[model samples]
Target chain A: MAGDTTITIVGNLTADPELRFTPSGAAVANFTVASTPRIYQTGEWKDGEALFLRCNIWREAAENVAESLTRGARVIVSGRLKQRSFETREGEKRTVIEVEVDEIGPSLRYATAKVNKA
Target chain B: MAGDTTITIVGNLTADPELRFTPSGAAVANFTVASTPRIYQTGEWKDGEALFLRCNIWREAAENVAESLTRGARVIVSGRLKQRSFETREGEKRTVIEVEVDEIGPSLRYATAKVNKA
Candidate 1:
């Protein structure tokens, strides 16, 4: 996709997926992913910095996520990175990066999954 | 990680990873990831544009990858995206984007994995 930034992340959800609806009744889901890097030191592993990214998914996937995942479940997320900028009345602009999630699934590295058609 | 852009890709390797060594004899590996997006049209799925990204990894992980993966194997890649630019004496500059891979593993979505610790 030209003119768009793409990113994928494997992280744990900080909270359960939030399912909502637009005024016209479109389903939307929101959640945050926490990716913490591990660094090795002296034959042991230490937690490094963590990146917390907020994400949104719509329609069937939104509902699917709400039912399939909860806090702390590791997931593989694919999405476009979007920077939202807004100006305050005071004339200052702030930008935040968020993900518009397209695909997501549980990571099997340390977990098992049962497939569902939904 | 503050000054870097991170990206993740889930795709098949176009070919087996090529392992090489630096002048100092440090192991390095290079390969390309080809991601094909699926678009839904008229109740059928269509292959959207594919993104082909070049990537590099180092050391034990590099050696591990060269052994554990092969051509057309679906894998999850996490890395920092870097832009390299060079100018000829004529003053024309060319730029390309590549990934500095930090973590990689086979995806279980359509395949099974039997991981061996390096």
Candidate 2:
């Protein structure tokens, strides 16, 4: 049996989503999100390493992401983590990890957003 | 200002963590987690794609994860995301993403765990 794993992330988009459609007309979007770490040190919060992740949104959510998000837009995203392995043209093996987004929205903690449901 | 992106995940350990200590004596542990998605379709639930992620636990929490978790143990993890870039031996550019865990514990949804404070 396959294992169960779910992940939620709040961060900023690294770039605008690249939207595309599958042969079956399924909507898909790809983008990257960057998250920075904060740690309590010496009685104050200090920033740590930042993380950048490739994210993929599918179907209706894909359409929404492409329409609503751009680079530097803060957002919250929840999804499953997936790993894909492939061989490069140089014959070097490589693995790519990404989030298969389930739900996403603009973060209201710093900015406000208007929602229009489809 | 750096962006705020928090992620929460519930999943199972893919393997036991490898514990190590920083030169300054900070505890650290590294492990992988796997999560599977379930979707409601046609009046029934079906499993979707599965995700695998690299997880990092630090300080006291690192010690706990290293000691408490083993392959297939259900757990909940919360953390900040981090990205690292490096060059491979062949001079190929590579980027790696991982979670800098803040809090983690065994999940009670499927099994029981006894907590011992450090």
Candidate 3:
């Protein structure tokens, strides 16, 4: 959609990436990121709720994510906002907002890396 | 409010940060970031729209942002989503989304820096 709200987030992955292909054999990877505010604003960092968001990426990028990342790996993700409506096995329906990932990479905020040509 | 949508953005500053204080003497800084999607999706990059998002940060961080950033400087910003509504000089009402910044720093993606203790 044109003029849709877009976002980027920096966080740690709570689990390894999940890679799968649809019936048409197009690759997609699913992952979740968890973030906590740093110590600021009267120590709300300790008292505030942590942000956890689910993300999806497609094709070659999806392959890269699965190959390079794992549980607890810090990352930077950029994507579009989307709403997902689904039904649970408990006969309940839920609507949640999720990210349709456009880009992702290892964060340099806390870790160092050596560059290599891909 | 809890469970608000959060976001991070990586882009170049469209202008220098504007620092101001409220009547109650609390500091706030405002800036806008501009970004364009990279080459992808059948050369759509050349035809696609650029993203320009306005952001706000408060207190000592406001002072730091004003001190450290300038026009065309690339940065990584993390914040919560907010909507601002106002009337235009043309007697029209307008509502737009904005970021209430929580954390920000120079991006390490395309640049390197020497460490300094603050």
Candidate 4:
């Protein structure tokens, strides 16, 4: 675990998880999360900012997210942060940051969810 | 705490924190973090991708970060994810995401440091 770095987040999904398969039949799901911050200002709390993050879930977790989540669903996710670099179609170099998820589930603080074991 | 969303991360500081004070006399420190992920594949471990995050620390923690951390320091941070929307000088609306830190400290996994409580 020399290079291991873990991150956990709670947010709302921007869209349904997209499920796909690799050539070797590994399952992968990708989605985005939007989180807003509230800060205390002027004797009351107010929304400060919003953060959008792309998340990737693999294998069994990928299948679970594909089945259980929808656009705007609140969830908690834990994973490692990953950076990807590529050249756009216009030949511009870009770096994108994403979360490689380890654990993800519906949040019960705002809404309730039925749990089913696989 | 109806809109509370928390995130935790372990990463290395990209640079020394920038400290500033708000008009109301609140101390704020800003910094960036870099985290690399490792994946197990084909009976071996390989580096997957990297993640970079912008973090903001307020009040006493801001002072602590300014005093204790430097570029390449490994630490753990816990905070709320915040998104901010603004109109650019050109009048285009844009949203940016950042972590409003609650707790942060040196990681003992890679190195050690002396802790002095404030």
Q: Which stretches in model 2 have alpha-carbon errors above 4 Å?
A: A1-12, A36-48, A60-78, A105-118, B1-3, B40-48
Measured over the true interface residues after superposition, the C-alpha RMSD of each candidate is: 8.6, 4.4, 8.6, 3.5
Compared with the true structure, what per-residue lDDT tens digits does model 4 show for residues A1-118? 6465566777799998999999999999999987765767378778745678889888987988899999999988888666667874667566566788988889998888888875
lDDT of each: 0.79, 0.78, 0.77, 0.80
The candidate, 1 or 4, that scores higher on TM-score is 4
Which is the better candidate, 2 or 3, if ranked by lDDT? 2
Model 4, B21-111: lDDT tens per residue?
A: 9999999999998776576736877874567888998898799899999989998888876665677466756555577898999899978
* Residue-pair clash count for candidate 2: 9
Candidate 4 — which residues are off by over 4 angstroms? A20-27, A35-51, A59-64, A85-96, A106-118, B1-3, B37-48, B86-94, B108-112
Best prediction by TM-score: 2
- Candidate 1, residues A1-118: lDDT per residue as tens digits? 2323477777789999989999999999999988776655368667655567789899988988999999999998988765456764766554455788989999998889999882
Arranged by TM-score, best first: 2, 4, 1, 3
Runs in model 3 deviating more than 4 A are A39-47, A89-91, B1-118
The ten-residue window of minimal lDDT in model 2 chain B covers B1-10
Q: Model 1, B50-77: lDDT tens per residue?
A: 5677789999889999998999988888
Clashes of each: 0, 9, 1, 7
Evaluated at residue A49, the lDDT of candidate 3 is 44
Report lDDT (Cα) of residue B87, candidate 1: 68
Name the candidate, 3 or 4, with the larger TM-score value: 4
